RNA sequence: GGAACAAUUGGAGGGCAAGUCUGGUGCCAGCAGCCGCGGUAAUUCCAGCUCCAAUAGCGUAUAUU
């Protein structure tokens, strides 16, 4: 279908993924958390399974950070978008800070490791990054744009 | 004058804490001529004024751009506070935050928006 | 080797018989012991 | 048969397709593209139409 | 030409001028037929007007 | 056929050995004897150089052949144990 | 007229860089017009104002004092030599050089 | 066999391949005769100037 | 630094000869076409034709549901 086509092919090209599996995994996991924000809705107010599990659920959500933590409500829970969690992903998050000059440049320093998250290298494009781990994206002391060696470009020119 | 003066309880606080977050993301053009220009070329998402100014007819000639453009600003009292929200070393008096198509700071200011939208 | 596809490939052609078995040698010339199991993975699927 | 560079490697094949995907985009539509120039108001750079409508009939 | 009829008779026959023959015209002949190119006998005083301005 | 999804069968004669256009499924088809039956069928080949493949009572490997001459059904698929296909596009050579 | 044929022309005058809405009637001519002039943006009078010597009396003067009126040659001497492919003094070359 | 006694290949002018100008072809107007535009009817006399 | 450190699998399409085959109230049409006059160290050709899908997985058969 059409709709279905043209749909993920914006997706990938907003955030420039691998592919529509890719894709299909961020839709699947869509799937389960509305799923579960639907069948909370099931539940009825002032019910304690529902007041738990919703805290408890909006909890891990905003502490993943893509909810806004303006709005803490089932309601936008269950209107959620797929857009805010690639706009989570990892490499979209180095293009909007600026690291790259392109999503796809930003992709390449996460496969050839020149960025950290915090302490540790992560090769992972996908990876997710928390609202309080959002911060500490900085380049590798080992990376060249960090510091260290010069590199291996720049080592064989200036041999 | 600067009747849409912002109150106390945390909006003055909001507001720095957004500044410092357009500070970091780039989206945020600072001091008097640049807010000009900004608005001026209607890019603009709000803007901030200061109010313990000397003499205030600077941040009260931008309300001018800002009552034709109809762009939401807001009046905030301490301008050295701004200069640090902003991280600066330069006490600031004006300043324009400007609006991207994909962000989530663009939903904080589109929940500042509404705050000052009510407050004015 | 060459001798060794031309001959596969004279198997192929006038027959192939019953059976016929493989012989990797020469495995203690190999330093690496991961390159050598990478060089049995490859060789054999380039066998089948 | 022969295969190009972008089929072979399939991620910089979907960058290409949504760029001309993109400007095949400004060819049906206006996309907001910046606002007027720093320069100052040239006109419409690109001609203007009286007998061209295109409000859509509610 | 060959289901012609011998007789017809439109009015651009009172105004035009026509074919005729290789008698008719001579050594100019070809069968078309002339169309005036624009131009025309200038009577006296247009003549005069203008020589004047040359 | 049967309940099975292939069948194996003996190549009895490529009738339409004697053709005039090429890409002909006259030219195409051939003769077949389903072995477990005994049956005598005709199926078609994709393509006429794989017809220069096939020749007579090899085992061929059968199918089902579903979208000038409709009504053949089956399709050739494996023969003497190989890939038709990979021999076309020459990957493998044919066990005689 | 000449104005008039340059502006239902516009199109080519810029030589690829910019591709206006193709607003053509066939009678290129509005009933109703009037040939005006640009005053002042008092905004911008740096640049955006023509010098005196560039203040020119007509339309086609200006873009005859623009440039790429070489470029304009080159593509006219173009379809020139492709319009002059075949059609006569090709022929002409060709007897020639049979008859000798 | 060429290369031992010194032969070159056998390679011919007029059949090794080439890139040929296609002139664009354009015919003659139409050329009809003096009697012809004599005899025929008023309605498709030909107009010459 | 691509002629490589050598992306794949399906589908659809377009372009062609001093070639072949078949049909007919002349040039049309059809299918087709590695086969063409020469030429294999010769050629440098659509110079890597175009587009759709999936993509380190996918196709097809049958049963189906």
Redesign the pocket.
Known sequence: EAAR?DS??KLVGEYGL?????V?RVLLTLSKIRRAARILLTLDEKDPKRLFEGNALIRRLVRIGVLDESRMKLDYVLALKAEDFLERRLQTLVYKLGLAKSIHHARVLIRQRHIRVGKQIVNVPSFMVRLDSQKHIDFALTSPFGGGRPGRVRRKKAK | AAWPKAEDPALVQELLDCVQQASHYRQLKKGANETTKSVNRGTSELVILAADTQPLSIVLHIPLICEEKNVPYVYVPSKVALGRACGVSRAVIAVSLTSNEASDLNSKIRALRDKVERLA | EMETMEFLNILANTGMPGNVFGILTHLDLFKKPSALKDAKKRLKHRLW | ?????E?????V??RK?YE?KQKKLRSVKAVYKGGEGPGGYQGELSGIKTNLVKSVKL | AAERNEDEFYFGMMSRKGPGSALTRGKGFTGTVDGDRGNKALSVETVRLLKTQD | FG????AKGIVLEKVGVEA?????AIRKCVRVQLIKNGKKVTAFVPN??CLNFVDENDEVLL?????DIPGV?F?V?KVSGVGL?ALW?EKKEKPR | KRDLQLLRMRDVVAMGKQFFKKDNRKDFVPEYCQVGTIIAGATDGVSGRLTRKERKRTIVEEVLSSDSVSKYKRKYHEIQEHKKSGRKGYYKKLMAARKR | I??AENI?????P????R?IERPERHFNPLRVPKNLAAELPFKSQIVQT
Do not use: I, M
């Open positions: 086509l993920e092919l691998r592919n529509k599996r890719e299909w | 048969p022969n295969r190009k560079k089929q072979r490697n399939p991620r094949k979907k397709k001309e | 309940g099975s999804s292939h005039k256009q090429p890409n002909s006429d150089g199918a089902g052949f579903g979208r059904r399709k698929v296909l596009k | 060429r290369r070159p290949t056998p390679q011919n007029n059949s090794t391949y890139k």
